[PDB]
């Protein structure tokens, strides 16, 4: 009987450890869930804004081309004036 | 190909002990290898190997062709031996660099997918659906129109 | 989609690579031998007198000095080029493998199968307590 | 590989000794560094009672021992006990004789020279190792993250130090070492628990208070709001069962114990918290590498495992730093063993294989060799 | 970097550090022996320069590969 | 002793269940860690490309400003020389 | 391209090395000429840390380097570093071995002979070029404008020189070389920024002050009116973001930094500004070519890129010059690379193809060949 009781105590401590494992696993998993969601949202927003900037940059390219051509014209006019 | 049959011929008894333990675990008595998807992963993780859960999903999605869950022990043993990592780094990076130096007939700092096709044609081999398309597609995986040295390495990295 | 062709591709690539290796080795041996035969003229055991042989000796000494100057110049060029190649190898290492350096490591080899370690310790403690009684 | 042998990556630490062979993922044997002589008389004859239980054995017989740590604040104050700890670590927890293995100890920054010299003299004379090398505890933690820049805050149990590194070039004039660490938090928790009635005094009960701190305490995101909430509701009171029953209930002591890190005025220390010594350590650096250090702030060490610290620290630094810079705090899940993982990586490198202090070199220059080129 | 040192080192290896010696002052048998020795040494040097040309070609291939890798990686 | 044996076997089956729960949590942990690593790498790339775009937009904007002002001045001068 | 042989038009300069093959429109590789050894200790092993980062690589790691220009004022003060810069330029930025390409260096007027002779000796012995030729930096800038007369003011970063030329016949007695240039303006800006609280001291922060000068400073049309306006309103204060945040606001430092060009008494120099040394250089010329020089005043060099300088200079010269002459200031938009474009044009000419200093000629007369007929 005493040997069996010793066995029981061992099983008790092992069950305790198992529940401990369960709790720590859950906590870490919830943490990583939070980080996952925040990272995903921020990634989405960052991609959106970067694409916006790209579009504006292309528009600026076209504007610059227009201005360059007009400056060429004015320069030719001025030199002929000279 | 014949490599699976040769591996069956050279069955490593060290891994055969683990595979017979897997036999006993799966076969609960007069059982026809029902192929339990969770059992496959439990056995693979139990045997000390590091199966990617990607490969476990592969095993889930590529079994039971008869539709009744019964799978031949020959095929199951073949899958188990092949999915287990039995290779040594697939030659050396220096050897691969020397081979790529050999393969650069164009001498333009890299090789070409059609150059690979022509050279493999010179090897005197029949090309089929297994050949031709995916071989050249995966040679230039980044699809640069030419297979560079890094692409050459990544195509056959860790390959014997 | 499949990846079974990798094995036969491996076999074919290995065969053709070995063929290229042996071919280049044989061609290199042939070309170096013919180059040496064109540049290294074998000496003669007859046909030249003492004065002729000593004149040939001094002329060959001058020619050997010239070709050794050429060889030392090209050797210095090759040493500088190989130092530059090593420098570029270090440069590309910094460019690419500065992130890949910590990737190479071997872990999880022993503690992965220490499930019974606590059981073994408790068994030893029980054995000691039994020896006590 | 081939001939040759494996290196022993020991890491003395202060509170937990972590050791193991080079090239693995985790230390092989981790056990508290305490040596406790028995204090009562002892009446049973032939029980086989030893004179000093070290390591994890003295955490099971701690009811009748007087545990005393041999390392106070990074420095080693009791050399005989430290020698005993090392002997135990080599022979019983790893079972490898030191005559056939190089060793790689670790040392906090800005420590007394005599400590390091005595350490190398012991390793070469008593244990008689082939070659040993001493490395700063923060560079290893930077190795383990796989980075090459970044400012690492290694808040151990003995001492908290903050070493900034850029492109592999350490900045020796910007190391800010502060002596608040886990042990002072344990003492402060043991001191504020007395406000509810629980008195822990014995050096054995310090371990119980340490367990309470590990399992229950957490760092509050905002201190005043938590103090107000814990004083009205009762959603925070978590209970804990002592080693004999009589459960205890911790109220607002939960987030007040680790708050000492950000307000060292609680334990009477003058200096600023770990949230402001990092910003000061950054501002001492040059003006062109501050963005990279802002973006690659690394946490390590045991005490940085409190739930919710990687957000409080980021909020504080974002408050201090200019609004344009991005503040990112790297908090790997393997924080506790980060220093040892980095030590294993460093010992496994081929380029590092000629930096060891070979024994013949020590025989020619004495223990003062460590301060020389072989750092 | 003290290019004078580079020039003097090149000159020394040209005319001093190398095996510089006038040898046509020996008896017939000994002169023939020394001429054979010098011929074998210069045969070794010709093999050396062949290998130098080969490795220079290989290193040119390697630097081209490095340039291609840099271009594709940036 | 019989009662104790009963409790021993019950705790035994409980311990086996505990071990299985532990392994399941372990696998979940590895999985979520993998996911987080991937998403964070994507975050790095997204932020960096955003920064590149923003910088280029800034530079093009400035150049546009300069050239436009020069063109306007030269236009005024063209009228003057008329 | 293909067969044939192209020339390398290098242009050492002082502050930016500009190089490229002859016959193009713009230099292929433009990068600062700085060589910076690391200054801290360095703790990471195997990081692949070099001993000297040159060119544009040292403008990214400048946080832990000590950058030092190898060319002070036109002249070269540190020959080893200059050799390193040339080696980098040939092998890594152009990737063309110099054994198969003629080179066309450029040199400021009135420079020491030993500098030029050492330059040609290096190019012929170390890099072993087939043939090299040295040209005065102002004649090229006159080539690029497509003129054949005119007085060119080439205000570089090292030295400002003013070479008048008529009908292709240079006037050697009318060259006025002044040593105020962009570097002194950077130092003066760094010195007047201290009046608001911003202190830049490190040699790395000189680059930040240079960026401030490039992006914000402008030349005032009338100095006193601007000084009065900036002291009453606040329409001038433009802000700028440092490499780490903490934006700064530049007030009347904007037009006071480049004003030093027209009043060199600010930095203690005695001489007259660039507005009066041009008029003096003209007045030394003969009485019959002064109208043409007045009408064809050419600007070049980097430092003449300040917004609003082509009007201030014209106003000043019109004040000095007789009322009847027409004063015109040629300020092409491609001012910075004007010297290199002219160098490309000159190297692409067929008539010039026999002026190179062939190597056999150098072997026969030594490095002193450069002062001879092959100028």
UniProtKB/Swiss-Prot annotation, chains A, F:
GO terms for biological process: actin filament organization; cardiac muscle contraction. The molecule is in a coiled coil structure that is formed by 2 polypeptide chains. The sequence exhibits a prominent seven-residues periodicity. It is found in: Cytoplasm, Cytoskeleton. The keyword Acetylation applies. The gene is TPM1. Binds to actin filaments in muscle and non-muscle cells. Plays a central role, in association with the troponin complex, in the calcium dependent regulation of vertebrate striated muscle contraction. Smooth muscle contraction is regulated by interaction with caldesmon. In non-muscle cells is implicated in stabilizing cytoskeleton actin filaments. Keywords: Acetylation, Actin-binding, Coiled coil, Cytoplasm, Cytoskeleton, Muscle protein, Phosphoprotein. Its main location: cytoplasm. Transmembrane segments: none annotated. It comes from Sus scrofa (Pig). Homodimer. Heterodimer of an alpha (TPM1, TPM3 or TPM4) and a beta (TPM2) chain. Interacts with HRG (via the HRR domain); the interaction contributes to the antiangiogenic properties of the histidine/proline-rich region (HRR) of HRG. Interacts (via N-terminus) with LMOD2 (via N-terminus) and TMOD1 (via N-terminus). Induction: Induced by hypoxia. This induction is reversed by exposure to normal levels of oxygen. One of its GO terms (molecular function) is protein heterodimerization activity. The modification Phosphoserine is found at residues 41, 53, 73. Belongs to the tropomyosin family. It comes from the Eukaryota. The keyword Amino-acid biosynthesis does not apply. The chain holds residues 134 to 215 of 284 of the full protein. GO terms for cellular component: actin cytoskeleton; actin filament; cytoplasm. This is Tropomyosin alpha-1 chain.
Swiss-Prot record, chain B:
PROSITE patterns: EF_HAND_1 (PS00018), EF_HAND_2 (PS50222). The keyword Repeat applies. One of its GO terms (molecular function) is protein homodimerization activity. Pfam families: EF-hand_7 (PF13499), EF-hand_8 (PF13833). Keywords: Acetylation, Calcium, Metal-binding, Muscle protein, Phosphoprotein, Repeat. Residues 15-50, 51-86, 91-126, 127-160 form the EF-hand domain. GO terms for biological process: cardiac muscle contraction; regulation of muscle filament sliding speed; skeletal muscle contraction; transition between fast and slow fiber; ventricular cardiac muscle tissue morphogenesis. The modification Phosphoserine is found at residue 97. Ca(2+) 1 binds at residues 64, 66, 68, 70, 75. GO terms for cellular component: cardiac Troponin complex. Ca(2+) 2 binds at residues 104, 106, 108, 110, 115. Ca(2+) 3 binds at residues 140, 142, 144, 146, 151. Cardiac muscle Tn-C can bind 3 calcium ions per molecule. Domain I does not bind calcium. Troponin is the central regulatory protein of striated muscle contraction. Tn consists of three components: Tn-I which is the inhibitor of actomyosin ATPase, Tn-T which contains the binding site for tropomyosin and Tn-C. The binding of calcium to Tn-C abolishes the inhibitory action of Tn on actin filaments. Belongs to the troponin C family. This is Troponin C, slow skeletal and cardiac muscles.
């Amino acid at each position: 009987a005493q040997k069996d009781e010793e066995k029981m105590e061992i099983q008790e401590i092992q069950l305790k450890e198992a529940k401990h494992i369960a709790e720590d696993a859950d906590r870490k998993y919830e943490e990583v869930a939070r980080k996952l969601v925040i990272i995903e949202s921020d990634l989405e927003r960052a991609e959106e804004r970067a694409e916006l900037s790209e579009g504006k940059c292309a528009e600026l390219e076209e504007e610059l081309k227009t201005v360059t051509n007009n400056l060429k014209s004015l320069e030719a006019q001025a030199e002929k004036y000279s | 190909d014949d490599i699976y049959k040769a591996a069956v011929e050279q069955l490593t008894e060290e891994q055969k002990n683990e595979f017979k333990a897997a036999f006993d675990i799966f076969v609960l008595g007069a059982e026809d290898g029902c192929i339990s998807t969770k059992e496959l992963g439990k056995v693979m993780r139990m045997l000390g190997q590091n199966p990617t859960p990607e490969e476990l999903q592969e095993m889930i999605d590529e079994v039971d062709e008869d539709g009744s869950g019964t799978v031949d022990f020959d095929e199951f043993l073949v899958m188990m031996v092949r999915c287990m990592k039995d290779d040594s780094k697939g030659k050396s990076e220096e050897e691969l660099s020397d081979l790529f130096r050999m393969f650069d007939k164009n001498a333009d700092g890299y090789i070409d997918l059609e150059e690979l096709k022509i050279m493999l044609q010179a090897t005197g081999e029949t090309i089929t659906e297994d050949d031709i398309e995916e071989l050249m597609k995966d040679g230039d995986k980044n699809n640069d129109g030419r297979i560079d040295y890094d692409e050459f390495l990544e195509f056959m990295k860790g390959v014997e | 989609i499949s990846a079974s062709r990798k094995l036969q591709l491996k076999t074919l690539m290995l065969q053709i690579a070995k063929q290229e290796l042996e071919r280049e080795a044989e061609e290199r041996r042939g070309e170096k031998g013919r180059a040496l035969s064109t540049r290294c003229q074998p000496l003669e055991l007859a046909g030249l007198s003492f004065a002729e042989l000593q004149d040939l000796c001094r002329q060959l000494h001058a020619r050997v000095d010239k070709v050794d100057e050429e060889r030392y110049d090209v050797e210095a060029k090759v040493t500088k080029n190989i130092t530059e190649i090593a420098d570029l190898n270090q440069k590309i290492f910094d460019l690419r493998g500065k992130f890949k350096r910590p990737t190479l490591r071997r872990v999880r080899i022993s503690a992965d199968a220490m499930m019974q370690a606590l059981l073994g310790a408790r068994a030893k403690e029980t054995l000691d307590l039994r020896a006590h009684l | 590989d081939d001939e040759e042998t494996t290196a022993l990556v020991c890491d003395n630490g202060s509170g937990l000794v972590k050791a193991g062979f080079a090239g693995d993922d985790a230390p092989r044997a981790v056990f508290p560094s305490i040596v406790g002589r028995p204090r009562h008389q002892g009446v049973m004859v032939g029980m086989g009672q030893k004179d000093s239980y070290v390591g994890d054995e003295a955490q099971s017989k701690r009811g009748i021992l007087t545990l005393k740590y041999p390392i106070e604040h990074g420095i080693i104050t009791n050399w005989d006990d430290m020698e005993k700890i090392w002997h135990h670590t080599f022979y019983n927890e790893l079972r490898v004789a030191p005559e056939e293995h190089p060793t790689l100890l670790t040392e906090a920054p800005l420590n007394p020279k005599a400590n390091r010299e005595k350490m190398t003299q012991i390793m070469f004379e008593t244990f008689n190792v082939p070659a040993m090398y001493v490395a700063i505890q923060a560079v290893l933690s930077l190795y383990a993250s796989g980075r090459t820049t970044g400012i690492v805050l290694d808040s151990g149990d003995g001492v908290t130090h903050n070493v900034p590194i850029y492109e592999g070039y350490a900045l020796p004039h910007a190391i800010m070492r502060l002596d608040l660490a886990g042990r002072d938090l344990t003492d402060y928790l043991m001191k504020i628990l007395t406000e509810r009635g629980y008195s822990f005094v014995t050096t054995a009960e310090r371990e119980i208070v340490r367990d309470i701190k590990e399992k229950l305490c957490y760092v509050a995101l905002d201190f005043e709001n938590e103090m107000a909430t814990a004083a009205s509701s009762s959603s925070l009171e978590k209970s804990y069962e002592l080693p004999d029953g009589q459960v205890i209930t911790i109220g607002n002591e939960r987030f007040r114990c680790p708050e000492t890190l950000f307000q060292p005025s609680f334990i009477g220390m003058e200096s600023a918290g770990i949230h402001e010594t990092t910003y000061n350590s950054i501002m001492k650096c040059d003006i062109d590498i501050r963005k990279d250090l802002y973006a690659n702030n690394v946490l390590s060490g045991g005490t940085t495992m409190y739930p919710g610290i990687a957000d409080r620290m980021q909020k504080e630094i974002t408050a201090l730093a200019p609004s344009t810079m991005k503040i990112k705090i790297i908090a790997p899940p393997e924080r506790k063993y980060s220093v040892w993982i980095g030590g294993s990586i460093l010992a496994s490198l081929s380029t590092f294989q000629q930096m060891w202090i070979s024994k013949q070199e020590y025989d020619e220059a004495g223990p003062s060799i460590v301060h020389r080129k072989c750092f | 970097g003290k290019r004078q040192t580079e020039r003097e080192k090149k000159k020394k290896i040209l005319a001093e550090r190398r095996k510089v010696l006038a040898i046509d002052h020996l008896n017939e048998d000994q002169l023939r022996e020394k001429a054979k020795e010098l011929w074998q040494s210069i045969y070794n040097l010709e093999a050396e320069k062949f290998d130098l040309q080969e490795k220079f070609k290989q290193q040119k291939y390697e630097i081209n590969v490095l340039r291609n890798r840099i271009n594709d990686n940036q």
